[PDB]
Amino acid sequence: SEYDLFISHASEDKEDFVRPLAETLQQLGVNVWYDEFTLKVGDSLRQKIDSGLRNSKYGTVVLSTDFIKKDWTNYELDGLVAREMNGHKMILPIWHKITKNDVLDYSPNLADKVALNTSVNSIEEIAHQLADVILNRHH
Amino acid sequence: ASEYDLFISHASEDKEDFVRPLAETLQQLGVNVWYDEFTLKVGDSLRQKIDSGLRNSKYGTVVLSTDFIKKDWTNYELDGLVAREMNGHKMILPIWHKITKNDVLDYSPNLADKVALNTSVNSIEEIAHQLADVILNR
């Protein structure tokens, strides 16, 4: 209903990364659900994102190589990661297990976006960042 | 003190995806590079592979992916292997490929604040220029 955040991801990053992150976010009083937003190989990413944005104040995608390869049909994936509906907005994409070269091939525009990187940032740091935004902290 | 300029240790999953194009680029920049025999399969000995590569290669490097660290279950002290020195050869510039900060923190915490390359922030050509600068004293 009044969910704070949803996490779009690929099936491969669900238990490896998304679940601990969702639990860590729950520890900071952040309502987050992800089970229904796993991206299957034949699923439509746009449909999933708009559905989640209807019921969630904020959104984010876990960008891994699997993610961009799964939905082969997506040309303009760069626009999706900042999609906004009602007073809900998609924020802070998470570059998870992806290469700069891969991003350059599929969506070059994605390179110049505000994002988080799990190679340089831990789950706790990433959760604190998302919690800073969602909880209107230092503002 | 060897014939080959560089060898690349990697996991089986990054061989054709990453190590192959990177080695191809390195050869385009005049660096004798071989990686084909240094794939780390499950149950393999990382130390044995690294020492073997250092026998015939001036320099070495490891492609750190989550897969790579998962391979060697017997590897407790992985921090030392990525700077191992044998004869007059040294292991240089680890390449963080498809890894998490948490994953690295779990297996070898000392590596987290060590000089490395990141395939998420740097392209293959970008990474090869750094590698070739060091190996060829440019």
Side-chain angles (χ1 to χ4, degrees), chain A residues 3-35 37-39 41-42 44-45 48-53 55-69 71-74 77-88 90-123 125-139, chain B residues 1 4-31 33-46 48-54 56-69 71-72 75 78 80-86 88-124 126-137:
Chain A
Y3 283 121
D4 297 7
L5 190 71
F6 77 101
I7 316 184
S8 211
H9 58 295
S11 306
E12 303 83 348
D13 316 305
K14 188 185 202 166
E15 316 294 334
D16 206 68
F17 164 82
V18 174
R19 154 169 251 174
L21 166 70
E23 284 184 323
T24 289
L25 282 170
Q26 257 161 8
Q27 268 166 10
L28 309 160
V30 170
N31 285 271
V32 55
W33 59 319
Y34 63 91
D35 212 38
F37 305 116
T38 298
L39 189 74
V41 154
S44 196
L45 175 48
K48 273 307 190 32
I49 286 156
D50 60 54
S51 149
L53 258 170
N55 293 355
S56 306
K57 317 180 174 150
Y58 292 101
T60 199
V61 298
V62 169
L63 294 176
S64 53
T65 279
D66 299 315
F67 187 95
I68 62 185
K69 290 190 170 198
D71 176 320
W72 154 249
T73 79
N74 74 64
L77 158 58
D78 45 286
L80 268 177
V81 296
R83 180 142 184 62
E84 160 166 11
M85 268 144 52
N86 192 40
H88 311 159
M90 290 273 290
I91 54 170
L92 297 172
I94 299 171
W95 286 39
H96 184 40
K97 276 167 191 192
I98 204 165
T99 312
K100 172 73 108 199
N101 268 81
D102 277 328
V103 169
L104 289 185
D105 310 348
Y106 288 65
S107 293
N109 280 351
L110 260 166
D112 53 56
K113 298 251 143 201
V114 180
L116 303 158
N117 206 322
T118 75
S119 34
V120 315
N121 284 131
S122 57
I123 280 155
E125 294 160 43
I126 272 171
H128 276 166
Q129 276 292 96
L130 288 172
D132 274 320
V133 172
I134 298 186
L135 294 212
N136 253 308
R137 310 219 272 216
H138 61 57
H139 162 286
Chain B
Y4 272 107
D5 277 50
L6 182 84
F7 89 92
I8 316 187
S9 212
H10 56 290
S12 306
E13 297 78 345
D14 319 317
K15 186 178 208 179
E16 328 290 357
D17 193 53
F18 177 77
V19 191
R20 161 174 223 191
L22 169 71
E24 276 194 24
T25 292
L26 285 175
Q27 254 165 347
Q28 268 172 20
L29 282 74
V31 153
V33 55
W34 67 332
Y35 65 93
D36 195 14
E37 305 92 310
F38 305 96
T39 307
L40 198 80
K41 323 159 224 315
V42 192
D44 282 16
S45 191
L46 184 58
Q48 195 178 308
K49 281 262 163 90
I50 273 170
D51 283 346
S52 147
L54 281 182
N56 294 336
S57 318
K58 274 211 301 193
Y59 297 108
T61 195
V62 300
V63 158
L64 259 62
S65 70
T66 292
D67 283 349
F68 185 82
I69 59 186
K71 311 292 195 168
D72 211 326
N75 202 328
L78 202 151
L81 282 153
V82 305
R84 175 145 198 125
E85 171 130 21
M86 193 138 273
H89 310 137
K90 164 152 281 303
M91 287 295 284
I92 65 156
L93 283 177
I95 305 164
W96 290 31
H97 181 38
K98 280 182 193 148
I99 200 165
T100 312
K101 167 80 118 201
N102 297 86
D103 286 327
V104 157
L105 283 179
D106 290 350
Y107 293 62
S108 41
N110 304 328
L111 286 194
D113 53 88
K114 294 288 211 55
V115 173
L117 301 159
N118 223 307
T119 74
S120 76
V121 316
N122 287 126
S123 86
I124 277 145
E126 288 183 55
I127 272 163
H129 269 40
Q130 286 193 64
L131 275 188
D133 272 22
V134 184
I135 293 160
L136 304 176
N137 227 43

PDB file of all heavy atoms in Angstrom, chain A residues 108-132, unseen atoms left out:
ATOM      1  N   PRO A 108      24.729   4.279 -23.139  1.00  0.00           N
ATOM      2  CA  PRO A 108      25.809   5.205 -22.768  1.00  0.00           C
ATOM      3  C   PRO A 108      25.341   6.304 -21.833  1.00  0.00           C
ATOM      4  O   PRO A 108      26.092   6.724 -20.940  1.00  0.00           O
ATOM      5  CB  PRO A 108      26.261   5.768 -24.122  1.00  0.00           C
ATOM      6  CG  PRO A 108      25.933   4.703 -25.101  1.00  0.00           C
ATOM      7  CD  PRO A 108      24.696   4.003 -24.587  1.00  0.00           C
ATOM      8  N   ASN A 109      24.085   6.729 -21.971  1.00  0.00           N
ATOM      9  CA  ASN A 109      23.590   7.852 -21.180  1.00  0.00           C
ATOM     10  C   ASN A 109      23.579   7.511 -19.697  1.00  0.00           C
ATOM     11  O   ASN A 109      23.786   8.386 -18.840  1.00  0.00           O
ATOM     12  CB  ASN A 109      22.191   8.217 -21.661  1.00  0.00           C
ATOM     13  CG  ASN A 109      22.215   9.070 -22.915  1.00  0.00           C
ATOM     14  OD1 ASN A 109      23.275   9.534 -23.349  1.00  0.00           O
ATOM     15  ND2 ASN A 109      21.047   9.254 -23.523  1.00  0.00           N
ATOM     16  N   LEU A 110      23.440   6.226 -19.381  1.00  0.00           N
ATOM     17  CA  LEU A 110      23.383   5.812 -17.990  1.00  0.00           C
ATOM     18  C   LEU A 110      24.657   6.193 -17.258  1.00  0.00           C
ATOM     19  O   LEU A 110      24.641   6.343 -16.031  1.00  0.00           O
ATOM     20  CB  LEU A 110      23.189   4.298 -17.920  1.00  0.00           C
ATOM     21  CG  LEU A 110      21.810   3.707 -17.667  1.00  0.00           C
ATOM     22  CD1 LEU A 110      21.792   2.221 -17.969  1.00  0.00           C
ATOM     23  CD2 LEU A 110      21.408   3.956 -16.234  1.00  0.00           C
ATOM     24  N   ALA A 111      25.754   6.383 -17.993  1.00  0.00           N
ATOM     25  CA  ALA A 111      27.020   6.664 -17.339  1.00  0.00           C
ATOM     26  C   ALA A 111      26.969   7.990 -16.593  1.00  0.00           C
ATOM     27  O   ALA A 111      27.665   8.162 -15.586  1.00  0.00           O
ATOM     28  CB  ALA A 111      28.155   6.649 -18.360  1.00  0.00           C
ATOM     29  N   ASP A 112      26.176   8.948 -17.065  1.00  0.00           N
ATOM     30  CA  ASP A 112      26.190  10.262 -16.414  1.00  0.00           C
ATOM     31  C   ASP A 112      24.974  10.447 -15.515  1.00  0.00           C
ATOM     32  O   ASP A 112      24.253  11.442 -15.591  1.00  0.00           O
ATOM     33  CB  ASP A 112      26.263  11.390 -17.443  1.00  0.00           C
ATOM     34  CG  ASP A 112      25.192  11.293 -18.500  1.00  0.00           C
ATOM     35  OD1 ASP A 112      23.997  11.260 -18.130  1.00  0.00           O
ATOM     36  OD2 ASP A 112      25.544  11.276 -19.699  1.00  0.00           O
ATOM     37  N   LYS A 113      24.737   9.462 -14.661  1.00  0.00           N
ATOM     38  CA  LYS A 113      23.636   9.498 -13.719  1.00  0.00           C
ATOM     39  C   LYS A 113      24.177   9.397 -12.303  1.00  0.00           C
ATOM     40  O   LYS A 113      25.241   8.817 -12.061  1.00  0.00           O
ATOM     41  CB  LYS A 113      22.678   8.340 -13.954  1.00  0.00           C
ATOM     42  CG  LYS A 113      22.025   8.332 -15.296  1.00  0.00           C
ATOM     43  CD  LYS A 113      20.556   8.674 -15.199  1.00  0.00           C
ATOM     44  CE  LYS A 113      20.124   9.525 -16.381  1.00  0.00           C
ATOM     45  NZ  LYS A 113      18.896  10.273 -16.067  1.00  0.00           N
ATOM     46  N   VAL A 114      23.442   9.988 -11.369  1.00  0.00           N
ATOM     47  CA  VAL A 114      23.785   9.840  -9.965  1.00  0.00           C
ATOM     48  C   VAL A 114      23.473   8.399  -9.589  1.00  0.00           C
ATOM     49  O   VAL A 114      22.335   7.940  -9.749  1.00  0.00           O
ATOM     50  CB  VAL A 114      23.005  10.828  -9.098  1.00  0.00           C
ATOM     51  CG1 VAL A 114      23.375  10.667  -7.645  1.00  0.00           C
ATOM     52  CG2 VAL A 114      23.268  12.240  -9.557  1.00  0.00           C
ATOM     53  N   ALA A 115      24.478   7.674  -9.101  1.00  0.00           N
ATOM     54  CA  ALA A 115      24.266   6.270  -8.805  1.00  0.00           C
ATOM     55  C   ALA A 115      25.153   5.850  -7.650  1.00  0.00           C
ATOM     56  O   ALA A 115      25.956   6.627  -7.145  1.00  0.00           O
ATOM     57  CB  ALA A 115      24.533   5.402 -10.033  1.00  0.00           C
ATOM     58  N   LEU A 116      24.952   4.610  -7.207  1.00  0.00           N
ATOM     59  CA  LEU A 116      25.746   3.980  -6.164  1.00  0.00           C
ATOM     60  C   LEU A 116      26.451   2.780  -6.783  1.00  0.00           C
ATOM     61  O   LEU A 116      25.956   2.206  -7.748  1.00  0.00           O
ATOM     62  CB  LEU A 116      24.858   3.554  -5.005  1.00  0.00           C
ATOM     63  CG  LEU A 116      24.041   4.683  -4.382  1.00  0.00           C
ATOM     64  CD1 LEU A 116      22.825   4.093  -3.641  1.00  0.00           C
ATOM     65  CD2 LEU A 116      24.859   5.529  -3.439  1.00  0.00           C
ATOM     66  N   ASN A 117      27.617   2.412  -6.250  1.00  0.00           N
ATOM     67  CA  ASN A 117      28.385   1.286  -6.776  1.00  0.00           C
ATOM     68  C   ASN A 117      28.723   0.346  -5.633  1.00  0.00           C
ATOM     69  O   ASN A 117      29.359   0.761  -4.662  1.00  0.00           O
ATOM     70  CB  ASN A 117      29.659   1.752  -7.479  1.00  0.00           C
ATOM     71  CG  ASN A 117      30.129   0.771  -8.528  1.00  0.00           C
ATOM     72  OD1 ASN A 117      30.047  -0.440  -8.336  1.00  0.00           O
ATOM     73  ND2 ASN A 117      30.618   1.282  -9.646  1.00  0.00           N
ATOM     74  N   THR A 118      28.297  -0.915  -5.742  1.00  0.00           N
ATOM     75  CA  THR A 118      28.540  -1.852  -4.652  1.00  0.00           C
ATOM     76  C   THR A 118      29.990  -2.297  -4.561  1.00  0.00           C
ATOM     77  O   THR A 118      30.356  -2.920  -3.557  1.00  0.00           O
ATOM     78  CB  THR A 118      27.653  -3.098  -4.769  1.00  0.00           C
ATOM     79  OG1 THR A 118      28.155  -3.948  -5.809  1.00  0.00           O
ATOM     80  CG2 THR A 118      26.216  -2.725  -5.064  1.00  0.00           C
ATOM     81  N   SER A 119      30.821  -2.016  -5.570  1.00  0.00           N
ATOM     82  CA  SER A 119      32.234  -2.358  -5.434  1.00  0.00           C
ATOM     83  C   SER A 119      32.918  -1.416  -4.460  1.00  0.00           C
ATOM     84  O   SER A 119      33.767  -1.833  -3.665  1.00  0.00           O
ATOM     85  CB  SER A 119      32.940  -2.306  -6.786  1.00  0.00           C
ATOM     86  OG  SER A 119      32.397  -1.283  -7.596  1.00  0.00           O
ATOM     87  N   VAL A 120      32.527  -0.149  -4.485  1.00  0.00           N
ATOM     88  CA  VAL A 120      33.117   0.848  -3.609  1.00  0.00           C
ATOM     89  C   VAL A 120      32.313   1.070  -2.337  1.00  0.00           C
ATOM     90  O   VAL A 120      32.857   1.589  -1.356  1.00  0.00           O
ATOM     91  CB  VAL A 120      33.259   2.186  -4.353  1.00  0.00           C
ATOM     92  CG1 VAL A 120      33.812   1.968  -5.737  1.00  0.00           C
ATOM     93  CG2 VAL A 120      31.917   2.860  -4.451  1.00  0.00           C
ATOM     94  N   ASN A 121      31.041   0.692  -2.320  1.00  0.00           N
ATOM     95  CA  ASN A 121      30.163   0.959  -1.195  1.00  0.00           C
ATOM     96  C   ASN A 121      29.578  -0.346  -0.672  1.00  0.00           C
ATOM     97  O   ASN A 121      29.220  -1.241  -1.449  1.00  0.00           O
ATOM     98  CB  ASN A 121      29.027   1.894  -1.584  1.00  0.00           C
ATOM     99  CG  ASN A 121      29.467   3.342  -1.700  1.00  0.00           C
ATOM    100  OD1 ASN A 121      29.167   4.019  -2.687  1.00  0.00           O
ATOM    101  ND2 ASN A 121      30.194   3.822  -0.696  1.00  0.00           N
ATOM    102  N   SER A 122      29.480  -0.445   0.645  1.00  0.00           N
ATOM    103  CA  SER A 122      28.941  -1.632   1.275  1.00  0.00           C
ATOM    104  C   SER A 122      27.421  -1.567   1.333  1.00  0.00           C
ATOM    105  O   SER A 122      26.799  -0.548   1.029  1.00  0.00           O
ATOM    106  CB  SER A 122      29.511  -1.785   2.681  1.00  0.00           C
ATOM    107  OG  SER A 122      29.241  -0.641   3.476  1.00  0.00           O
ATOM    108  N   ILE A 123      26.819  -2.681   1.748  1.00  0.00           N
ATOM    109  CA  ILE A 123      25.370  -2.721   1.880  1.00  0.00           C
ATOM    110  C   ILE A 123      24.918  -1.723   2.932  1.00  0.00           C
ATOM    111  O   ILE A 123      23.905  -1.037   2.762  1.00  0.00           O
ATOM    112  CB  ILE A 123      24.904  -4.144   2.211  1.00  0.00           C
ATOM    113  CG1 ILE A 123      24.870  -4.989   0.938  1.00  0.00           C
ATOM    114  CG2 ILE A 123      23.521  -4.117   2.858  1.00  0.00           C
ATOM    115  CD1 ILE A 123      25.015  -6.483   1.188  1.00  0.00           C
ATOM    116  N   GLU A 124      25.650  -1.632   4.044  1.00  0.00           N
ATOM    117  CA  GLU A 124      25.288  -0.672   5.081  1.00  0.00           C
ATOM    118  C   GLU A 124      25.378   0.760   4.576  1.00  0.00           C
ATOM    119  O   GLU A 124      24.474   1.563   4.817  1.00  0.00           O
ATOM    120  CB  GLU A 124      26.190  -0.855   6.295  1.00  0.00           C
ATOM    121  N   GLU A 125      26.450   1.096   3.860  1.00  0.00           N
ATOM    122  CA  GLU A 125      26.584   2.451   3.330  1.00  0.00           C
ATOM    123  C   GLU A 125      25.473   2.760   2.335  1.00  0.00           C
ATOM    124  O   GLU A 125      24.904   3.856   2.337  1.00  0.00           O
ATOM    125  CB  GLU A 125      27.943   2.618   2.651  1.00  0.00           C
ATOM    126  CG  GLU A 125      29.158   2.528   3.561  1.00  0.00           C
ATOM    127  CD  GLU A 125      30.433   2.211   2.784  1.00  0.00           C
ATOM    128  OE1 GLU A 125      30.636   2.810   1.706  1.00  0.00           O
ATOM    129  OE2 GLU A 125      31.224   1.355   3.245  1.00  0.00           O
ATOM    130  N   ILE A 126      25.160   1.804   1.466  1.00  0.00           N
ATOM    131  CA  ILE A 126      24.140   2.012   0.446  1.00  0.00           C
ATOM    132  C   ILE A 126      22.778   2.179   1.103  1.00  0.00           C
ATOM    133  O   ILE A 126      21.959   3.019   0.696  1.00  0.00           O
ATOM    134  CB  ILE A 126      24.178   0.823  -0.536  1.00  0.00           C
ATOM    135  CG1 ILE A 126      25.196   1.107  -1.650  1.00  0.00           C
ATOM    136  CG2 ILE A 126      22.806   0.542  -1.087  1.00  0.00           C
ATOM    137  CD1 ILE A 126      25.475  -0.067  -2.548  1.00  0.00           C
ATOM    138  N   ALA A 127      22.516   1.384   2.132  1.00  0.00           N
ATOM    139  CA  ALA A 127      21.262   1.498   2.851  1.00  0.00           C
ATOM    140  C   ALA A 127      21.167   2.833   3.569  1.00  0.00           C
ATOM    141  O   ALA A 127      20.095   3.440   3.606  1.00  0.00           O
ATOM    142  CB  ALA A 127      21.134   0.353   3.845  1.00  0.00           C
ATOM    143  N   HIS A 128      22.280   3.309   4.140  1.00  0.00           N
ATOM    144  CA  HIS A 128      22.268   4.607   4.803  1.00  0.00           C
ATOM    145  C   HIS A 128      21.985   5.712   3.802  1.00  0.00           C
ATOM    146  O   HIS A 128      21.281   6.672   4.114  1.00  0.00           O
ATOM    147  CB  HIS A 128      23.597   4.863   5.504  1.00  0.00           C
ATOM    148  CG  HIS A 128      23.695   4.252   6.870  1.00  0.00           C
ATOM    149  ND1 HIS A 128      24.894   4.122   7.541  1.00  0.00           N
ATOM    150  CD2 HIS A 128      22.747   3.742   7.692  1.00  0.00           C
ATOM    151  CE1 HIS A 128      24.680   3.556   8.715  1.00  0.00           C
ATOM    152  NE2 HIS A 128      23.385   3.317   8.832  1.00  0.00           N
ATOM    153  N   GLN A 129      22.536   5.597   2.593  1.00  0.00           N
ATOM    154  CA  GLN A 129      22.285   6.601   1.555  1.00  0.00           C
ATOM    155  C   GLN A 129      20.802   6.649   1.199  1.00  0.00           C
ATOM    156  O   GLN A 129      20.163   7.714   1.229  1.00  0.00           O
ATOM    157  CB  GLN A 129      23.115   6.249   0.315  1.00  0.00           C
ATOM    158  CG  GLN A 129      24.562   6.729   0.314  1.00  0.00           C
ATOM    159  CD  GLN A 129      24.671   8.224   0.227  1.00  0.00           C
ATOM    160  OE1 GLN A 129      24.805   8.911   1.244  1.00  0.00           O
ATOM    161  NE2 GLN A 129      24.630   8.750  -0.997  1.00  0.00           N
ATOM    162  N   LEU A 130      20.233   5.492   0.868  1.00  0.00           N
ATOM    163  CA  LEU A 130      18.815   5.440   0.521  1.00  0.00           C
ATOM    164  C   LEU A 130      17.951   5.916   1.688  1.00  0.00           C
ATOM    165  O   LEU A 130      16.937   6.590   1.484  1.00  0.00           O
ATOM    166  CB  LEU A 130      18.438   4.024   0.097  1.00  0.00           C
ATOM    167  CG  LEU A 130      18.965   3.588  -1.266  1.00  0.00           C
ATOM    168  CD1 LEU A 130      18.695   2.099  -1.469  1.00  0.00           C
ATOM    169  CD2 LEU A 130      18.376   4.370  -2.415  1.00  0.00           C
ATOM    170  N   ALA A 131      18.330   5.563   2.919  1.00  0.00           N
ATOM    171  CA  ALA A 131      17.594   6.000   4.094  1.00  0.00           C
ATOM    172  C   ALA A 131      17.728   7.497   4.311  1.00  0.00           C
ATOM    173  O   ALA A 131      16.791   8.138   4.796  1.00  0.00           O
ATOM    174  CB  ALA A 131      18.108   5.251   5.326  1.00  0.00           C
ATOM    175  N   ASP A 132      18.889   8.064   3.984  1.00  0.00           N
ATOM    176  CA  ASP A 132      19.050   9.507   4.052  1.00  0.00           C
ATOM    177  C   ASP A 132      18.032  10.192   3.156  1.00  0.00           C
ATOM    178  O   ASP A 132      17.406  11.185   3.552  1.00  0.00           O
ATOM    179  CB  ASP A 132      20.469   9.890   3.641  1.00  0.00           C
ATOM    180  CG  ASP A 132      21.446   9.836   4.801  1.00  0.00           C
ATOM    181  OD1 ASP A 132      21.088  10.251   5.917  1.00  0.00           O
ATOM    182  OD2 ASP A 132      22.588   9.382   4.594  1.00  0.00           O
TER     183      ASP A 132
END
